[PDB]
Amino acid sequence: NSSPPAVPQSFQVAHLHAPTGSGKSTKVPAAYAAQGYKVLVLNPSVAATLGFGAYMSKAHGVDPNIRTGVRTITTGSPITYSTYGKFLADGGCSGGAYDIIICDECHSTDATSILGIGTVLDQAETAGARLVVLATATPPGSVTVSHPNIEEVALSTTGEIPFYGKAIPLEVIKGGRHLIFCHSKKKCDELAAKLVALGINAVAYYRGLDVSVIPTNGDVVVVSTDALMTGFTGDFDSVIDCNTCVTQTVDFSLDPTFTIETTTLPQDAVSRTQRRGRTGRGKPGIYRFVAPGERPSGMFDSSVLCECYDAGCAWYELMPAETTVRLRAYMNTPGLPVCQDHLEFWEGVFTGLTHIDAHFLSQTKQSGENFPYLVAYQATVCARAQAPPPSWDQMWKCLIRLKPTLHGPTPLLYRLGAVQNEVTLTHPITKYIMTCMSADLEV
Amino acid sequence: SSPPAVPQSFQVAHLHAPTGSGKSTKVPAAYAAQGYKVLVLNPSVGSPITYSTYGKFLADGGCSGGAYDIIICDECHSTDATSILGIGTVLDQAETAGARLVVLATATPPGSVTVSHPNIEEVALSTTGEIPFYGKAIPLEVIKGGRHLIFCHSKKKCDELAAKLVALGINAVAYYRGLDVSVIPTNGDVVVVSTDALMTGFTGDFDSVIDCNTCVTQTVDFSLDPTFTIETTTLPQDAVSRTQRRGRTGRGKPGIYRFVAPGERPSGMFDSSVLCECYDAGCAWYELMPAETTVRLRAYMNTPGLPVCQDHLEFWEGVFTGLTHIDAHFLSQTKQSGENFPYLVAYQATVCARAQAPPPSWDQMWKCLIRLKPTLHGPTPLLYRLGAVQNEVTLTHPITKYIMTCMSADLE
Ligand SMILES: [Ca+2]
Ligand SMILES: [Ca+2]
Numbered sequence: 001n002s003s004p005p006a007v008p009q010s011f012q013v014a015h016l017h018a019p020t021g022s023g024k025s026t027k028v029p030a031a032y033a034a035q036g037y038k039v040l041v042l043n044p045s046v047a048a049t050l051g052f053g054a055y056m057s058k059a060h061g062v063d064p065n066i067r068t069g070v071r072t073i074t075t076g077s078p079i080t081y082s083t084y085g086k087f088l089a090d091g092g093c094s095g096g097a098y099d100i101i102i103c104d105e106c107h108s109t110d111a112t113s114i115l116g117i118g119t120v121l122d123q124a125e126t127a128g129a130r131l132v133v134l135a136t137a138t139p140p141g142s143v144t145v146s147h148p149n150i151e152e153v154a155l156s157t158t159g160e161i162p163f164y165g166k167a168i169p170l171e172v173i174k175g176g177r178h179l180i181f182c183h184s185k186k187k188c189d190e191l192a193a194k195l196v197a198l199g200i201n202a203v204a205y206y207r208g209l210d211v212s213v214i215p216t217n218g219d220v221v222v223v224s225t226d227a228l229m230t231g232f233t234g235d236f237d238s239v240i241d242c243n244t245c246v247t248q249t250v251d252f253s254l255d256p257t258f259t260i261e262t263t264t265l266p267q268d269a270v271s272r273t274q275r276r277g278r279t280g281r282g283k284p285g286i287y288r289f290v291a292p293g294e295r296p297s298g299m300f301d302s303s304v305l306c307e308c309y310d311a312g313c314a315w316y317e318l319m320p321a322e323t324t325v326r327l328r329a330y331m332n333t334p335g336l337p338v339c340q341d342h343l344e345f346w347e348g349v350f351t352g353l354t355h356i357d358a359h360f361l362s363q364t365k366q367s368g369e370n371f372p373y374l375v376a377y378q379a380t381v382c383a384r385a386q387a388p389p390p391s392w393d394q395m396w397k398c399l400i401r402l403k404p405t406l407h408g409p410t411p412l413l414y415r416l417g418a419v420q421n422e423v424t425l426t427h428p429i430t431k432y433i434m435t436c437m438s439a440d441l442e443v
Numbered sequence: 444s445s446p447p448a449v450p451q452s453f454q455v456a457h458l459h460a461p462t463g464s465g466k467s468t469k470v471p472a473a474y475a476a477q478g479y480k481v482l483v484l485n486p487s488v489g490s491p492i493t494y495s496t497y498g499k500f501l502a503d504g505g506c507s508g509g510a511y512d513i514i515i516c517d518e519c520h521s522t523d524a525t526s527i528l529g530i531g532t533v534l535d536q537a538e539t540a541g542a543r544l545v546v547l548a549t550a551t552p553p554g555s556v557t558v559s560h561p562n563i564e565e566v567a568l569s570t571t572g573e574i575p576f577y578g579k580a581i582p583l584e585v586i587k588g589g590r591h592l593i594f595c596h597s598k599k600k601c602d603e604l605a606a607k608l609v610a611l612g613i614n615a616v617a618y619y620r621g622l623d624v625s626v627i628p629t630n631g632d633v634v635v636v637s638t639d640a641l642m643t644g645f646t647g648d649f650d651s652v653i654d655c656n657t658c659v660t661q662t663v664d665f666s667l668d669p670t671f672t673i674e675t676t677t678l679p680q681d682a683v684s685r686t687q688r689r690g691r692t693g694r695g696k697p698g699i700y701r702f703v704a705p706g707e708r709p710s711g712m713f714d715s716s717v718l719c720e721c722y723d724a725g726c727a728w729y730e731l732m733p734a735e736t737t738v739r740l741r742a743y744m745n746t747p748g749l750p751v752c753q754d755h756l757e758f759w760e761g762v763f764t765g766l767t768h769i770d771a772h773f774l775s776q777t778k779q780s781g782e783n784f785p786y787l788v789a790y791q792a793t794v795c796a797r798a799q800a801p802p803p804s805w806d807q808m809w810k811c812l813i814r815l816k817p818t819l820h821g822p823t824p825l826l827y828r829l830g831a832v833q834n835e836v837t838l839t840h841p842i843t844k845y846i847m848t849c850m851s852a853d854l855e
Contacts, residue, residue, distance in 0.1 A: 141682075141709035143554030165754060184855070244753075251664070264855065266712055266751040269554070291754070292747035295712045296554045299679070331704075338679050338706035340657075341578065442597065442677065 004028045011125040016135040024135045025104045029079045030060040038078040039100040049083045084116025092119045096128030107136040109300035109337045111307035118330030140298025144273045150280035152287045164242045164290040180223040180240040191223045233278045238286035250303035256425045257433045259415040269297040300339045309350045310373040320347040345440035352432045353377045363398040391420040446470045453538040458548040466548045474513045481513035497529025505532045506540030519547040522713035524720035531743030556682040556709045565700040577655045577703045589650040591634040596657045605636045652692040656704035663716035669838040670846040672828040681708040712751045722759045727786040733760040758853035765845045776811040803832040
């Protein structure tokens with residue numbers, strides 16, 4: 001639906017699939033507000049959420065409420081901006097206080113977005129909402145299109161700088177600001193250095209690497225992971241894309257049980273569009289690529305469901321079964337990212353993870369781990385057996401007191417990283433998880 | 444409309460046109476009419492127009508220097524090894540063998556979904572019925588009476604379903620990779636609970652088709668036991684799968700399509716194990732040096748508008764180069780067993796034979812080694828996992844160290 005959905009006399013779920021140009025998060029809510037409706041606009045980033053309030057004030061004479069976990073600006077207004085996470089943290093839909101709920105950037109396959117969107121899909125009507133718009137410029141199945149404000153040019157094997165099978169010639173990047181996307185930290189570094197060898201000032205940016213990129217529009221080539229979030233990104237004469245990315249994948253390896261790991265795969269449509277798009281911000285730019293292909297958008301990994309369950313327990317006080325209610329509505333609602341149906345399995349494993357250690361859980365949460373619940377739970381079983389974590393990496397920090405937890409074999413329940421210690425596969429909970437896999441996972 | 448007319452220079456066009464074009468009838472006859480001798484290639488198939496197959500094209504060695512002006516690679520969305528290798532070979536040799544136009548024809552382009560079907564009364568499934576079909580349920584008033592086809596992803600899934608049905612009064616016949624005619628040919632009311640092993644061309648004349656919307660595919664795991672593992676995976680079906688599953692119903696009659704899940708995937712990428720198959724097939728079938736395979740595969744990968752895959756070209760070419768001194772006799776045998784990776788099977792058999800050791804398991808994949816009198820040597824030197832390993836293994840054979848190294852170097 002290219003136009004902003006019309007609020008119906010009775011509850012309904014509409015899909016607004018308009019380009020990033022339409023003010024889906026700004027012009028749209030303002031429009032509904034002007035009709036007298038109370039709208040809630042949800043986005044994945046705090047950057048975004050906080051940003052929409054500013055714009056609105058000036059650009060739309062609307063001073064909205066901006067709810068973020070770190071800042072909750074409240075000014076009794078029909079338009080409320082919040083991140084899916086703060087939404088989920090605030091109890092969900094939790095009052096008959098919105099006529100319209102815009103789930104913006106609804107194509108996001110991060111745990112907090114899927115859980116946040118399924119929560120709306122399951123509570124809006126009952127909460128007194130007549131419209132829930134699933135907005136996105138990249139619906140599932142989308143392949144990147146274009147806007148000739150960007151000239152796309154295939155890299156070739158001819159060139160002084162070796163690049164993912166191809167080669168970047170010096171004449172394209174030396175002289176000007178350019179952004180080169182690499183799938184990993186190493187590549188970012190190894191590329192920057194070699195770029196410097198040839199007399200260019202490359203800046204390798206990635207996770208935990210404080211923003212060291214130069215704002216001044218001088219000459220520079222920034223080689224980085226996607227960790228360079230958008231928003232400020234823009235003044236680059238071009239971008240050179242490796243056309244790949246690292247993704248979290250679950251592996252039902254059957255070591256004791258499953259493994260959360262990564263795989264580097266061809267990028268999908270939103271990744272390319274997002275990478276490509278960091279040039280051509282007013283002045284026409286160029287996009288140079290290693291591969292002419294990608295994968296369409298709208299498919300996420302089972303590990304993300306595992307994440308939704310890990311979030312429900314750790315941050316949202318949701319019994320695995322309440323989480324399955326929310327995620328099931330997401331999987332029952334058409335026109336959204338797709339993933340293999342593993343709700344019974346995940347719900348099944350998390351329900352058996354009873355009596356987690358409260359302190360360990362606080363620690364793993366504050367520490368910003370990917371799976372605070374699965375981490376603190378493995379720590380919990382280890383401590384109760386007086387056994388050591390599977391490795392002494394940062395992850396298992398909360399068990400720091402390796403002294404009593406000396407007795408070797410760790411009762412491994414699953415693998416969230418590299419396992420260094422000798423393990424044992426006979427813990428009741430390990431065995432419980434294997435039954436859940438036999439019970440809900442075929443082969 | 445029409446296909447891209449023959450240009451002044453050689454180019455690669457995209458007849459991303461469906462059945463409404465006649466890519467296997469009218470698109471060729473058009474070019475033939477203009478005086479052009481066309482070669483049309485499909486997974487399955489004088490006058491200036493030859494209709495063939497990709498596999499037959501590889502068997503013949505590819506493009507003949509001066510034979511066709513037009514080459515249409517039909518069903519260019521096909522990601523089975525032979526199709527990938529065949530399209531890459533055309534893309535690599537086309538021009539130099541005198542071709543002016545290469546049209547990549549596909550009824551379902553990238554990012555394309557379920558087709559507009561004006562006859563199949565398609566309906567969503569509701570959770571109503573005591574025939575729970577994949578988390579939901581089926582109403583036996585839909586299956587009792589008339590001929591039908593339910594698609595499950597597994598053999599054992601087909602088995603159990605046909606079973607719950609028979610205990611409810613329905614004539615259910617399970618069908619998967621095995622015996623046909625299990626479905627009666629002219630007796631109605633039958634219900635076939637099939638795996639995709641029942642090919643589309645078969646057509647059991649069905650009233651409806653209920654789809655589980657899932658699929659099983661071959662995938663490789665870089666498991667690092669010794670090296671890698673050829674295995675499978677279940678994933679949401681895609682726009683191509685739905686089309687072929689739902690296109691099976693009626694065929695002459697209107698028909699109906701029932702489905703569990705609302706989603707799928709508009710086509711997509713193909714696994715790295717298919718890359719392995721191409722190197723395996725090149726070695727085993729086409730007398731192709733790994734580097735020749737790499738050239739043809741790179742041609743495919745450099746062309747826009749084709750399914751994508753991970754760039755493992757160097758890795759695979761690297762592992763097959765180290766697959767030295769294979770037993771010509773085991774390979775002749777694995778090739779005729781209709782094995783999946785005849786080269787890799789025949790190679791693992793050679794290192795066992797050489798070592799006088801038994802295969803990983805005694806599954807019929809290893810029938811070339813039935814002289815297990817001396818090949819009883821307890822530990823089998825595991826080069827990789829192609830199936831279930833039931834025998835004690837050793838991981839010190841040089842080829843194992845070689846593949847591991849290739850992994851380290853080529854895979855991050
Ligand atoms: Ca696996
Ligand atoms: Ca593992």
